[PDB]
Amino acid sequence: MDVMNRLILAMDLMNRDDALRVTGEVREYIDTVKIGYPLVLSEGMDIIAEFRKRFGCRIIADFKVADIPETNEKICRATFKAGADAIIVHGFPGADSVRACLNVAEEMGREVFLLTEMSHPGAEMFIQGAADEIARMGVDLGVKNYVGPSTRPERLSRLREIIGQDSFLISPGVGAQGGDPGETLRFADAIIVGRSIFLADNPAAAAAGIIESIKDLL
């Protein structure tokens, strides 16, 4: 996956007008948008096709899929029918649940991203202690795309160690949650950035600023 400027916009505005406007203002800087449940549940799954129509960007559906295999398969189907290129899946519910997603993605020409460790403080309670094993499970299952935390660079580095340099790794928690763009890109192929861009007075300048700060990494 070739992410322009190694920067993925997390579009978590809940109003269609704002979401389209802000994305439009930063379109010259990005070609990959992560769309999650805040926007999809507020404006519908049709928003994905609209983004493709307007921007021709790749769409990562950040749905943190975390159900039983039967349900995971249905969620993946509905998601790819809506035009998502990839979907983010939790690893914590185990191998069979991940496999269900892998199977649908294969059938529909899409990718699964496996979320191992999360970026927020609560991740320390249960997820962190399982995260390395979740990553090894990904490797065992043939997963090639991963998500890990900008907020804990040592954990992000460990994730990179486990999955190897050939796997693709994206990382949220940059900006608002305290992660540093450049440090995160020591380990991740791409950074995910939401509020630091879309809540800015001038989202274009915000994106431009981040890119300038990592210019030697591009």
Q: What is the largest CA-CA distance in the chain?
A: 45
From 53, 64, 144, 215, the catalytic residue: 64
According to CB under 8 A, which one of 18, 24, 44, 178 is a site residue for a second copy?
Answer: 44
Structure token pair of residue 27:
């379109």
- C-alpha dihedral over 48, 39, 69, 150, to 10 degrees? 100
Q: Which is nearer to a second copy, 102 or 211 (CB)?
A: 102
Both tokens of 173, joined, read: 């928690």
Bridge partner residues of 169 (DSSP): 146
Among positions 9-38, residues that touch a second copy (CB under 8 A) are 12, 14, 36-38
Residue 134 found at the interface with a second copy (CB under 8 A): yes
Contacted by 69, from a second copy, ligand BMP, none: CB < 5 to 8 Å by type: a second copy
* Amino acid found at 105: A
Q: Is 204 annotated as a binding residue?
A: no
Going by C-alpha positions, the residue among 9, 12, 3 that lies closest to residue 27 is 9
d(CA 35, CA 8): 10
Binding residues among 93-112 for a second copy as defined by CB under 8 A: 93-98
- The residues of the shown chain that bind a second copy, judged by CB under 8 A, are 12, 14, 36-38, 40-42, 44-45, 63-64, 66-71, 74-75, 77-79, 81-82, 90-98, 118-127, 130, 133-134, 137, 176-177, 195
